[PDB]
Ligand binder design. Sequence first.
Ligand SMILES: [Zn+2]
Lengths: 44, 123, 56, 112
Amino acid sequence: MKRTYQPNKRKRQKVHGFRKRMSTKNGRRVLASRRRKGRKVISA
Amino acid sequence: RKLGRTSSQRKAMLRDITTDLIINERIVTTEARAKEVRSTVEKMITLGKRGDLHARRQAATFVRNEVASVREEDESIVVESALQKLFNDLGPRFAERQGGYTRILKTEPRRGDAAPMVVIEFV
Amino acid sequence: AVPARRTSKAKKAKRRTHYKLTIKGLNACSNCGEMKKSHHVCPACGHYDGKDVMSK
Amino acid sequence: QITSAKATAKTVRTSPRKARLVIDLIRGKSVADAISILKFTPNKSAGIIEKVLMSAVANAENNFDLDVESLVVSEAFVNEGPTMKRFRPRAKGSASPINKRTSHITVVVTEK
RNA sequence: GUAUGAGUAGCGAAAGACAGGUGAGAAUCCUGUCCACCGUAUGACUAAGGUUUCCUGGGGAAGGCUCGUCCGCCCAGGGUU
RNA sequence: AGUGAACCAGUACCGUGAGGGAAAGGUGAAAAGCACCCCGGAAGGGGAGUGAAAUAGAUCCUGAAACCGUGUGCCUACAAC
RNA sequence: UUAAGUGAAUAAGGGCGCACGGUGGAUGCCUUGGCACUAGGAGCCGAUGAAGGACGGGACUAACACCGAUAUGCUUUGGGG
Ligand SMILES: [Zn+2]
């Protein structure tokens, strides 16, 4: 029947976005951790 | 006999093959279809030897309906529908030859399936 | 079920002995002396029974 | 003085086990009838080993050897080449590998 | 990395045949004819979603559950007012 | 082995997301990297050449084992290993 | 010639040894990177817009570097030939 990963464009940028991760005190921990590891795509 | 498919598919395949080999006098196919088609063709040429109505209206069910054969013009476009050929050209060409008018020639297998092919002729 | 052992090196052959490929029925054609298959049209000569067939 | 030119072809795209049957028919015979024997074999491995044998002939004739009418196939074998590797989606999630193999074939043509 | 099982199981529902092309090579490409299948859909338009797969000209090393001159594949050019 | 990473690596790839994370160095002193002929559609190969050495020819120093083959000196079709 | 008795040799294929190749990359030698420290400098950057990035810049431009509409670079002061 119906499987999970039904993809959209708005939702994937209003959940895992950037501004939605520069709008907290925890999102910044996430970002800085992704920058320490030396990652390319900090956040989708 | 030799089945190849369901019933009606075989019937259509034979009603196909013996309608060529009426128009070209020659055909290159496999070995089994060859044997069944020599039987059928020879059985559908004796009807070319009566030439009346009943033989016409009995032959007119084992031949692809309309398949032109036009190499003729005087000042016109004469069309021969591959049955009219059966009753105009092949018929009067076999009056003295009795049964058995086809030759089968075993040539060579094929590239992709090794199905030993064969020819069919008329004289 | 499912094998209870690997087959030795010997048994492999001793079973494959009957896995061959034989060619049979090779004749000398009559117009070019080349090998042809009996009861079959000559491919290079084109002839059969001393007569030409493949022509148009 | 040397006889018996050689020839070969590397990494042909077929099994080394199935194409080791065709060869069984050739080892030992004269060159003239060998071509015939190959001509009437309906295996993909047949339409190949000709080109090797024809090439060995043309090598021996063009370079050193002569009298194509006294040549004998004396040695011929089939080795295993490098094998590609690929997968295939099995049922119930998993997958199972697949080897696509290749072979090296040589043929040698002595005089007598 | 390579064996055994083994040249075994499988090749993922549905109808093709002939003639002539093309070409080193043809059941599997092109053309023609007859046949046949769906038709509240196997037909037409759109919203998501995919992101150049579209078109023109070349190629056949790898993908294509076989073949392949062919392709939603490879190479080059170009298209979205 | 030594950082996960001696090479275009926190990359390829996996997961919606936080997150998880590889394999991959060596021709010769110098490319002098095989003009020319021949079979072959091509790939591949045989001479001739470059080279001290081509079994150093781009999968490119040495090149073991499992595994796959060719030839041959000795034995084997009343035998329970 | 009869009779009785004895009875060798050949391999569809296989075993053992030897000899020669094929796949695969252990081992020998080697370093273009690492690891742990010593002595010394240095211990902040930011509303004059930071760290980190996106897009662009070449005859050819797919990537990496450097650069920024003055874009593979401008001015000046010393080195160098
Ligand atoms: Zn002939």
